[PDB]
Paper text:
In the present study, we showed that DR_0354 protein (DrXth), the exonuclease III homolog, possesses AP endonuclease, 3′-phosphodiesterase, 3′-phosphatase, and 3′–5′-exonuclease activities. In the present study, we characterized the unique ExoIII family AP endonuclease DrXth from D. radiodurans, which is widely distributed in Deinococcus species. The endonuclease and exonuclease activities of DrXth prefer Mg2+ and Mn2+, respectively. In addition, deletion of the drxth gene led to increased sensitivity to stress-induced DNA damage and a highly elevated spontaneous mutation frequency.
Residue numbers in the entry: 33 to 281
């Protein structure tokens, strides 16, 4: 049967656990869990019944990604390789049930010119890595915080953010090209034209008013991921878990 896959930027795994992440996992039982912004050193006992692969950043409390699964992992790959993205613990992958699952955390450029230029540069290198992965031809599912909203429908305040990191013209164009290289935006496919977000700031009732951005993605090639929605029944981090069904063949 199909596998339930969840991608989730936890904003610090220990913080998410304190808010109830293990309880959410106990109830929802994703077959594959792709985590971003783990921050912590590996915590293989945190979610009972899950095998885990961890790729922490060099800096304490910073970035870090992980893949957890109820089925055994195969060919765990830590990093790309890429000097800076590996130092920041931003990409991990493993094969589960014949599908290459990748957990990716792309950098924010919000802090200023320095990190925006970093983001622009490493996203070209990340695109090269993804395109080579697609040319290999094995089925792939990417769960990632990309820190990019694609179209106007993807953020409530689009008119006020066309000059802000995450919605800059070249970043929207990058996302179009990312999908055109051979990836389906599974949440958008499942939503049609409906608006749904994956991140809300902690400032000024933004979560309750649904003033959000869609910056987390489930992207697929060679396999369909259906039923994808954000889960807003919990507030385990600034993001919502994004979950759907991977229709294995």
């Amino acid at each position: 049967g199909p596998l339930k896959v969840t991608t989730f930027n936890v904003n610090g795994l220990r913080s998410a656990l304190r808010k109830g992440l293990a309880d959410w996992v106990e109830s929802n039982q994703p077959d594959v869990l792709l985590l971003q912004e783990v921050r912590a050193e590996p915590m293989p006992d945190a979610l009972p019944g899950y095998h885990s692969a961890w790729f922490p950043a060099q800096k304490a409390g910073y970035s870090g990604v992980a893949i957890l699964s109820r089925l055994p992992l195969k060919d765990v790959r830590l990093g790309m390789p890429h000097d800076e993205m590996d130092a920041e613990g931003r990409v991990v992958s493993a094969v589960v049930a014949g599908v290459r699952f990748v957990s990716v955390y792309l950098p924010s450029g919000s802090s200023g010119e320095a990190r925006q230029g970093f983001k622009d540069r490493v996203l070209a290198d990340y695109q090269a890595w993804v395109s080579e992965l697609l040319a290999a031809g094995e089925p792939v599912v990417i769960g990632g915080d990309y820190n990019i909203a694609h179209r106007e429908i993807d953020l409530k305040n689009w008119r006020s953010n066309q000059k802000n990191s995450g919605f800059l013209p070249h970043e929207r164009t990058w996302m179009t090209a990312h999908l055109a290289a051979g990836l389906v935006d599974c949440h958008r496919d499942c939503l049609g034209e409906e608006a749904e977000y994956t991140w809300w700031s902690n400032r000024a009732n933004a979560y309750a008013n649904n003033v959000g951005w869609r910056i987390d993605y489930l992207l697929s090639a060679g396999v369909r991921v259906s039923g994808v929605r954000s889960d807003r029944s919990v507030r385990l981090s600034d993001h919502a878990p994004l979950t759907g069904w991977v229709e294995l063949e």
